[PDB]
Design a protein around this nucleic acid. Structure first.
Ligand SMILES: [K+]
Ligand SMILES: [K+]
Ligand SMILES: [K+]
Ligand SMILES: [K+]
Ligand SMILES: [K+]
Ligand SMILES: [K+]
Ligand SMILES: [K+]
Ligand SMILES: [K+]
Ligand SMILES: [K+]
Ligand SMILES: [K+]
Ligand SMILES: [K+]
Ligand SMILES: [K+]
Ligand SMILES: [K+]
Ligand SMILES: [K+]
Ligand SMILES: [K+]
Ligand SMILES: [Mg+2]
Ligand SMILES: [Mg+2]
Ligand SMILES: [Mg+2]
Ligand SMILES: [Mg+2]
Ligand SMILES: [Mg+2]
Ligand SMILES: [Mg+2]
Ligand SMILES: [Mg+2]
Ligand SMILES: [Mg+2]
Ligand SMILES: [Mg+2]
Ligand SMILES: [Mg+2]
Ligand SMILES: [Mg+2]
Ligand SMILES: [Mg+2]
Ligand SMILES: [Mg+2]
Ligand SMILES: [Mg+2]
Ligand SMILES: [Mg+2]
Ligand SMILES: [Mg+2]
Ligand SMILES: [Mg+2]
Ligand SMILES: [Mg+2]
Ligand SMILES: [Mg+2]
Ligand SMILES: [Mg+2]
Ligand SMILES: [Mg+2]
Ligand SMILES: [Mg+2]
Ligand SMILES: [Mg+2]
Ligand SMILES: [Mg+2]
Ligand SMILES: [Mg+2]
Ligand SMILES: [Mg+2]
Ligand SMILES: [Mg+2]
Ligand SMILES: [Mg+2]
Ligand SMILES: [Mg+2]
Ligand SMILES: [Mg+2]
Ligand SMILES: [Mg+2]
Ligand SMILES: [Mg+2]
Ligand SMILES: [Mg+2]
Ligand SMILES: [Mg+2]
Ligand SMILES: [Mg+2]
Ligand SMILES: [Mg+2]
Ligand SMILES: [Mg+2]
Ligand SMILES: [Mg+2]
Ligand SMILES: [Mg+2]
Ligand SMILES: [Mg+2]
Ligand SMILES: [Mg+2]
Ligand SMILES: [Mg+2]
Ligand SMILES: [Mg+2]
Ligand SMILES: [Mg+2]
Ligand SMILES: [Mg+2]
Ligand SMILES: [Mg+2]
Ligand SMILES: [Mg+2]
Ligand SMILES: [Mg+2]
Ligand SMILES: [Mg+2]
Lengths: 147, 100, 51, 204
RNA sequence: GCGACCCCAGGUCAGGCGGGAUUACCCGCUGAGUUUAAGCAUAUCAAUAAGCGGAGGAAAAGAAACUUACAAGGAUUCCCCUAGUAACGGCGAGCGAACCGGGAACAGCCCAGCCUUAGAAUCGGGCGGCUCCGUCGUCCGAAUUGUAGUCUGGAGAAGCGUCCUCAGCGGCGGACCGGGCCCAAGUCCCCUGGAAGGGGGCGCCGGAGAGGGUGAGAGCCCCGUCGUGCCCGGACCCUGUCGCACCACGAGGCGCUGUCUACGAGUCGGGUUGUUUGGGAAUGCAGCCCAAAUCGGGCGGUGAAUUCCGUCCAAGGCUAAAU
RNA sequence: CCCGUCUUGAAACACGGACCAAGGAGUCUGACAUGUGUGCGAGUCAACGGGCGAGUAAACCCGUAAGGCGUAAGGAAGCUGAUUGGUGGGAUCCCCCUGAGGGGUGCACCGCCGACCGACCUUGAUCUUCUGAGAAGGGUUCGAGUGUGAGCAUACCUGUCG
RNA sequence: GUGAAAGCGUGGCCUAACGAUCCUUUAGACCUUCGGAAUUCGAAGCUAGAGGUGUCAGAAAAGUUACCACAGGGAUAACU
């Protein structure tokens, strides 16, 4: 929006806000990331530690699908069950719902948070952390593995 | 190549599925020729003979320099896989030649 | 000569407002049309409109 | 360069202004493609506007193997199981893919049933008006011989409903994490263990 | 000396083909530097500009010597995403793809080789006829150093029987594209003015109040505009319908059968050099050197040997659409 | 004392300017960032495309295991993956009392100190397929972590960079 | 280690005596990776040193111009 640009407020002020002494020259410090080690050294070290150098192993032709592993925490597991199925869970304590996280696009079950009180759940997943399994078991549930 | 265990890790991992043998294809016999082609190639070998480097290989196999024969074959043909196949071919030619 | 900063065709002409905001704007406009004070304020002559 | 900012990496050092692709023809492209589809539908009437029947195939790699999608064409093994000669299939709206293999029975059976369902609701007009040959319909050429718009055998997900089971003591004692760790360990020591077993045979 | 063949020469011999032009897009080659790196030589600018060639309405690409490692996808092209990512880089400045996934479109095929030998069944040209983009007859040639059929790995050949499929033209119409013609309503009264097309009054058309013209802001003065109707032509493609004809000998499909089952070479591949690529013990390309194989060969993004496994079948060719 | 300009310093024997008209210079775009407005919110985004539609470059509708960003981090990697707060100040409110008063309440924010996840180190009862599991117990170490989410889209100013 | 012991000792009585990224090389960890699955070479990583930048926060660098050029400088010489 041109009418809000501050250059308009500076019309008639000679230097357009860039000063009489310093002026606005083309590239008085080099272009782009020039001088990262010489005259912009302080800037890089102060704000971008680790910028220069090499670390770790290369991986030629690394495909990300091999590493696909979405995770879901314990505290979020109950939210996957439909509301109508939640009522059934509290209506019969003999059985427990079977939550197959893979059907909801999750592979591994992590163990952040707690489960609903007095509600056993059977969790079906590809992978699971030890804390997640412990919390499921101590709540009266069980873990089933799939692929 | 056992059926998958149904687990996502370990040996034979993967989704449980009933595996079946792939249906036979005409391309399965790729690399095999008819009896006539073998007959033609055998006849042309008699008419054409052997190349100079093949003669060098068989001469080394006569003096028992098997290791040096293979090195000559690899330098000429280029690959170890082809070199050792070529050496066996020369040995077969020599093996049934000394028996005649 | 050549004008300063010549106009280019790849100027960003269009805008994509979120759909939920566009529906919000439409609902407000529909509601405003049922208020005779607003309809009169916009310059419409509805002095003989029954309702 | 000044202040705390992300390091810039703009790739604008070539003559990029000569390679800008605008999209002002985007509405026109939509119009042209719609007209082509409308024109194609009248040409192939009464054949369905959705085109040839496509098979059900799994997504590739570990990230997408849980879903299914439309493939190129039915495999030769699938066509033979369904009793449809491969040379006749493309002439009755069935796509044929002579490259696709069948590694499992479930995949083969899913598409075989799809072909049989398609043949159940397929009306074939005779090549010549009066004389009727094998495979052609009779009295159905006028009853329900209309051009179907949109998909007729959609490939969709059937998400199972949550099932409530009874937790047995066997499942409660199962150590899922221990199973995973043991299975991982056996995988990365398979080569070493097989090595020493073979070496033991040489000594023995 | 007379003949056949081979190679070559001449011909204003009969009948054909080629050159050049155009630049927006397209294909091949060749190929900088300014510039950036706050200097500068690798790099970057750029596999770009300039230079030299070749096409079409599109071109190019294209029916896997592929992707991948999965519960597997399945010619090519294109869009979104992948991603400013893996990788490359005085690892500096910078640079930078691909697979999966979602969509547009969708189409598959033809040869070479063993296989007529009771018949070169093939093709061209001269001449003649006919229903003339062709077809028939006849003559002279091409061709056995191989024309036509059959076959192309998805197969296939051969045998057997199931007894399933296969043979044209014409008439009319529609659809498609192009053009032509007619067709609504005030120029009524008063005022101003050089002129009413302005103001005021009284009417009217409207599926037409797009636009223009006419002596000032004109729906109703004029051309048009909206919507029908009528007429003429082009494409020969697609499609509906009607009439006539409609020989399954053969070929194909399906099923089984012991057997057979031919697949591209100075090419692949390797060494080396140069170049190029994100491709890193070497991505492609090219020169030179070496030079294959047939239960084999290429690929599987770290060089090497050994044991497996997966995958495809190069070194010949054509092909609409999405762009 | 003549304006404009560079300058420690201009009326300057510093430079531009004979006069008038018209033209004449912080812009567009990509990335990112803070701030602010708006929508929705553990979600958010109709973006390629499709369905259509003002006979229509608009508007309207469509996300079905699409995708982007966010929702979980640490490690070069193989891999593992958050036991769910204590305290000193403190806004507001409640009660008593009418003091620079005393109790209850304790959000935001800040200081201090634990715990939890991971790299590294350390530790090992009891089991196991011999290399894994893990009762207990840790650390002046390290992290762009956790301890009841705050993001996503969009508009514009300003700033860095091409 | 030393002293009977308290204690002292993490170089020199104190105040100077020295060096990033990339690369190379060595040491250490019955360590991680070579991405179809393995074995052994080779290669690549993790942790700590070494090979050096003395213009010492660290480009790889010889002259001449009286044949000369450009951007500027009265921030700076050659007159008054
Ligand atoms: K300023
Ligand atoms: K365009
Ligand atoms: K003739
Ligand atoms: K007019
Ligand atoms: K063949
Ligand atoms: K190369
Ligand atoms: K192979
Ligand atoms: K000045
Ligand atoms: K001056
Ligand atoms: K002056
Ligand atoms: K900033
Ligand atoms: K989402
Ligand atoms: K959708
Ligand atoms: K580490
Ligand atoms: K220096
Ligand atoms: Mg000022
Ligand atoms: Mg200035
Ligand atoms: Mg400055
Ligand atoms: Mg600038
Ligand atoms: Mg440039
Ligand atoms: Mg698809
Ligand atoms: Mg002539
Ligand atoms: Mg420079
Ligand atoms: Mg410069
Ligand atoms: Mg220079
Ligand atoms: Mg050019
Ligand atoms: Mg030409
Ligand atoms: Mg042309
Ligand atoms: Mg086209
Ligand atoms: Mg073409
Ligand atoms: Mg093929
Ligand atoms: Mg493909
Ligand atoms: Mg991203
Ligand atoms: Mg480049
Ligand atoms: Mg795709
Ligand atoms: Mg033939
Ligand atoms: Mg046949
Ligand atoms: Mg056959
Ligand atoms: Mg008229
Ligand atoms: Mg009037
Ligand atoms: Mg006038
Ligand atoms: Mg009309
Ligand atoms: Mg071939
Ligand atoms: Mg080569
Ligand atoms: Mg070149
Ligand atoms: Mg072609
Ligand atoms: Mg001065
Ligand atoms: Mg002054
Ligand atoms: Mg003076
Ligand atoms: Mg000056
Ligand atoms: Mg002057
Ligand atoms: Mg002016
Ligand atoms: Mg904001
Ligand atoms: Mg998703
Ligand atoms: Mg670990
Ligand atoms: Mg810990
Ligand atoms: Mg002692
Ligand atoms: Mg000292
Ligand atoms: Mg050092
Ligand atoms: Mg190193
Ligand atoms: Mg590999
Ligand atoms: Mg210094
Ligand atoms: Mg010089
Ligand atoms: Mg001075």
């Amino acid at each position: 929006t041109t009418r809000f640009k501050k250059n308009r407020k500076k019309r008639g002020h000679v230097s357009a806000g860039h000063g009489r002494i310093g002026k606005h020259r083309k590239h008085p410090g080099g272009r782009g990331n020039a001088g990262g080690m010489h005259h912009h050294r302080i800037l890089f070290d102060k704000y971008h530690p680790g910028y220069f150098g090499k670390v770790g192993m290369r991986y030629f032709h690394k495909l990300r699908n091999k590493f696909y592993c979405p995770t879901v925490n314990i505290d979020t597991l109950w939210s996957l069950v439909p509301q109508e199925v939640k009522d059934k869970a509290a209506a019969n304590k003999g059985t427990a719902p079977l939550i197959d996280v893979t059907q909801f696009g999750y592979f591994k079950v992590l163990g952040k948070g707690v489960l609903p009180t007095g509600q056993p759940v059977v969790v079906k997943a590809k992978l699971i952390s030890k804390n997640a399994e412990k919390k499921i078991k101590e709540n009266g549930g069980a873990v089933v593995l799939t692929a | 190549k056992q059926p998958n265990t149904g687990i996502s890790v370990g040996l034979n991992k993967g989704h449980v599925v009933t595996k079946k043998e792939l249906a036979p294809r005409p391309s399965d016999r790729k690399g095999k020729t008819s009896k006539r082609i073998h007959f033609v190639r055998s006849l042309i070998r008699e008419v054409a003979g052997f190349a100079p480097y093949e003669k060098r290989i068989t001469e080394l196999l006569k003096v028992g320099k098997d290791k040096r024969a293979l090195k000559v074959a690899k330098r000429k043909l280029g690959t170890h896989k082809r070199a050792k196949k070529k050496r066996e071919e020369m040995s077969s030619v020599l093996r049934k030649m000394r028996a005649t | 000569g050549r004008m300063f900063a010549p106009t280019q065709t790849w100027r960003r002409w269009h805008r994509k407002i979120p759909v939920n905001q566009k529906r919000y704007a439409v609902a407000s406009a529909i509601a405003a049309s049922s208020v005779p004070s607003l309809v009169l304020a916009r310059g419409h002559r509805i002095e003989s409109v029954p309702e | 360069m000044k202040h705390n900012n992300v390091i810039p990496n703009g790739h604008f050092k070539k003559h990029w202004q000569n390679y800008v692709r605008t999209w002002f023809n985007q509405p026109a492209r939509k119009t042209r493609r719609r007209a082509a589809r409308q024109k194609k539908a009248a040409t192939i009437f009464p054949r369905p506007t959705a085109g040839s029947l496509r098979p059900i195939v799994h997504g590739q790699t570990l990230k997408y193997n849980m879903k299914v999608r439309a493939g190129r064409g039915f495999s030769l093994e699938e066509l033979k199981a369904a009793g449809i000669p491969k040379k006749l299939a493309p002439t009755i709206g069935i796509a044929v893919d002579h490259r696709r293999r069948n590694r499992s029975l479930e995949g083969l059976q899913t598409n075989v049933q799809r072909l049989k369902t398609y043949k159940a609701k397929l009306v074939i007009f005779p090549r010549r008006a009066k004389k009727v040959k094998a495979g052609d319909s009779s009295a159905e050429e006028l009853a329900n011989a209309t051009q179907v718009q949109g998909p007729y055998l959609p490939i969709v997900r059937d998400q199972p409903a949550i099932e409530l089971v009874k937790i047995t003591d066997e499942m409660k004692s199962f150590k899922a994490y221990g199973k995973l760790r043991i299975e991982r360990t056996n995988a990365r020591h398979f080569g070493a263990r097989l090595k020493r077993a073979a070496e033991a045979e040489k000594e023995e």
